Design a protein around this ligand. Sequence first.
Ligand SMILES: [Cl-]
Ligand SMILES: [Zn+2]
Length: 343
Amino acid sequence: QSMMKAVRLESVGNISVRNVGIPEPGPDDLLVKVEACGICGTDRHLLHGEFPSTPPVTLGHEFCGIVVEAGSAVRDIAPGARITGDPNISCGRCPQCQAGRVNLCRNLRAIGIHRDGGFAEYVLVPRKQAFEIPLTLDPVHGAFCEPLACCLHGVDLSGIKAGSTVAILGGGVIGLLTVQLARLAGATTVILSTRQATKRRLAEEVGATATVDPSAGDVVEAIAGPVGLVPGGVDVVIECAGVAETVKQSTRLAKAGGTVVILGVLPQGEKVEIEPFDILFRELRVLGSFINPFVHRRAADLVATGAIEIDRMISRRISLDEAPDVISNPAAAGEVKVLVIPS
Ligand SMILES: [Cl-]
Ligand SMILES: [Zn+2]
């Protein structure tokens, strides 16, 4: 019996590396030897039971790798191909799916959450979830397709286009990837707000036209105020931090007729005040953005053509053995994206 290492969430709070069997693909599965799998903030929430999962389960939903076996019914992608996985499996039979809102599937199952995922030497990927990418690519770049796709969906919803002005709240990987996508989509002012000096510097290396530090003063005044960067406000505000203060400020950062996108996850049940008078009289849009419907191929293409800076987003590369400790502890100060490299 051939074995592999895998980072298993045994039950809420209980995570460790175990030896498990190398899985055997069903007729429509690919078996993929993982080249890299990113750690997400969602993985820490999964560990602590703050998002639901189906333990015992191998975590990891931001992965790419080389196909080593194809199921009998797969004629399309052969061993040797590189793929990135879309972890989100929609059912195709519920009212959300039948209306094309596959991200809102009522029966959604996610690789790395309800099914064994990418923090392992090998992972099963149903054919429909596999997106081929070039073999000439850096082996780890494919791991960014999922987070890029989530950000690209948010940028699509925002209406960013040539000449837009944009404020991005939060200096995590989501904020930084959204800086890059804002510029690619045509925004000519892209401002990132974060208290972390290291993240402001990185934002400017990857396309931010300016950055602001919320410690130095009121961000609403610094951006949208009379002597701010963009007096009267920006076209588009994308809240990426999932923090109450910045969700609250987002509408006041937007110009009249502007758009706020809620891309960051604030804790369930937590409440924030809006002013309905202002939303109406300044004709604002407030839009939720959820995961990656119909954007994984575009994201994979952007990675394939080198349109996005990926290397600067990688703060650390770790082994499977190191993953449980990194996931069990809070994100480090200079952490952008940690990649788990199974070998
Ligand atoms: Cl962020
Ligand atoms: Zn469905």
